[PDB]
Amino acid sequence: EEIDTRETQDSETLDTADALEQKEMPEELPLDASWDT
């Protein structure tokens, strides 16, 4: 089956200040670590 996909994908261009501005939590941690460290 095939379904539509139009959701935006985050990339590196998101500036460091904007990361701290956002209240939401990132989908995947940029840092090479798990969700416990």
């Binding site: 500036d15 460091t16 200040a17 990361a19 701290l20 501005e21």
Partner: protein
């Protein structure tokens, strides 16, 4: 001596001042157009008050009202080191307390117009981001 106060300012209203003294002559000042009789609502002790650029008439808005400082004899006082007299183009909301031909002292108020942190701050500093209401700087030395 130690623990001695040697400064006291009241910057709630901008103190535009003149080094020279003398009478105040109203150049390019016309009642109703640029200046007006803004009698104080409680005491009435005031003078021909300059209106704001937008508040006054458009014809007077184009005109530049100035409070030139002359001597006690009416002769225009030239600014020291320059041929131009003591010319002062008042900005808007300029409350004039000195009537026409009123002697003044050195340093007199011609116009009486009033007046982050943490990690996101570090990220903003390292991303070199321009702020809101940036300070305006002079690009090259010269007379304004």
């Amino acid at each position: 001596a130690g623990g001695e106060t040697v400064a006291n300012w009241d910057p709630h209203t901008m103190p535009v001042i003149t080094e020279v003294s003398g009478f105040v002559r109203f150049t390019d000042m016309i009642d109703g157009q640029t200046i007006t009789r803004q009698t104080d609502e409680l005491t009435g002790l005031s003078s021909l008050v300059v209106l704001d650029s937008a508040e006054r008439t458009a014809g007077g808005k184009d005109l530049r009202p100035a409070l030139k400082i002359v001597d006690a004899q009416g002769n225009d006082v030239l600014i020291p080191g320059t041929d131009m007299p003591a010319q002062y183009f008042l900005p808007g909301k300029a409350i004039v307390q000195l009537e026409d031909g009123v002697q003044i002292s050195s340093g007199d108020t011609l116009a009486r117009i009033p007046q982050t942190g943490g990690l996101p701050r570090v990220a903003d500093l390292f991303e070199a981001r321009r702020p809101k209401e940036p300070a305006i700087l002079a690009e090259i030395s010269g007379i304004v």
